[PDB]
Design a protein around this ligand. Structure first.
Ligand SMILES: Cc1cc2nc3c(=O)[nH]c(=O)nc-3n(C[C@H](O)[C@H](O)[C@H](O)COP(=O)(O)OP(=O)(O)OC[C@H]3O[C@@H](n4cnc5c(N)ncnc54)[C@H](O)[C@@H]3O)c2cc1C
Length: 260
């Protein structure tokens, strides 16, 4: 359903990493979007209305505003299409004060009470989870995580996330995890993997490269019957290294391999 939010404010978290403050129309209510869903930000562009799915990441309690951290897809910086992209750039260029158009809640995943999941029709109850994200696919997962640890200490579920990302500096929500899953052990299991390691001198101890069975062995639990997987990332980073090795890792692919 539409809404008339607005660019209340902008905080470009780094190089090409935005932090958008689109407030609500009526600041007394929430962008009440069920944990398992996302908005379809409508910004009429070119001859289309570039409806791009997005899950803000901030707190559900937060009244009258919803936060979106973006990874802007700039120009003259990338082969195959040097250009970047109409919409994200457009969301950058877009100056504050300008009213946007939101659209919750268009999804399939959704977290019921403590532990269980409702899902595309059915619903499946899971104790320990598998969170092999990828890129800025952290947020739609964060949507589950934070909630799971807020509903604590009674939810007390297990999450073995695998923040798949491309480089050391490109670990978006580092701390919001790397602060969290320290004070909360048994609860969440963080893991960070990276192709390029900019500063060996910082001292890297997490994975170096991309998702492979060995990474998917220690950092991920057994599937069998009872464990769900909540993946998120570039399709190839799914066809060859999330679906195959996990297809072999005695887990269920059809019945529960979820993406968003
Ligand atoms: C539900 C959901 C939630 C999402 N949440 C977020 C979120 O928190 N943050 C966020 O930033 N996005 C999010 N995405 C949004 C979505 O994929 C967008 O298309 C994304 O924001 C890029 O939009 P754009 O207009 O630039 O995309 P498009 O116009 O579709 O073009 C971007 C495409 O071309 C490629 N591309 C272009 N330039 C580059 C480049 N510089 N480097 C690498 N690849 C390039 C990309 O691989 C990408 O898929 C999410 C996606 C989904 C499904």
């Amino acid at each position: 359903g539409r809404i008339h939010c607005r660019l209340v404010a902008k905080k470009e978290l780094s190089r090409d990493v935005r932090l958008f403050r689109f407030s609500l129309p009526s600041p007394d209510q929430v962008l009440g979007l069920p944990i398992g869903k996302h908005i379809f930000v409508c910004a009429t562009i070119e001859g289309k209305l570039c409806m791009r799915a997005y899950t803000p990441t901030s707190m559900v309690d937060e009244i009258g505003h919803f936060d979106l951290l973006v990874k802007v897809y700039f120009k003259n910086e990338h082969p195959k299409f040097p250009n970047g992209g109409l919409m994200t750039q457009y969301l950058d260029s877009l100056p504050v004060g300008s009213y946007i158009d939101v659209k919750g809640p268009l999804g399939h995943v959704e977290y019921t009470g403590r532990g269980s999941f409702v899902i595309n029709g059915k619903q499946r109850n899971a104790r320990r989870l598998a969170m092999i994200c990828g890129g800025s696919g952290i947020t739609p997962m964060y949507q589950i995580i934070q909630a799971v640890l807020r509903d604590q200490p009674e939810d007390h579920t297990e999450m073995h996330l695998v923040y798949a990302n491309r480089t050391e500096d490109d670990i978006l929500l580092r701390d919001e995890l790397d602060r969290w899953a320290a004070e909360y052990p048994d609860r969440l299991k963080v893991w960070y993997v990276i192709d390029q390691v900019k500063r060996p001198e910082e001292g890297w101890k997490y994975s170096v490269g991309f998702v492979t069975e060995a990474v998917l062995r220690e950092h991920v639990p057994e599937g069998g019957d009872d464990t769900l997987a909540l993946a998120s990332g570039p399709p190839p980073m799914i066809q060859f290294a999330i679906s195959p090795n996990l297809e072999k890792m005695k887990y269920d692919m059809a019945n529960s391999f979820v993406v968003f």
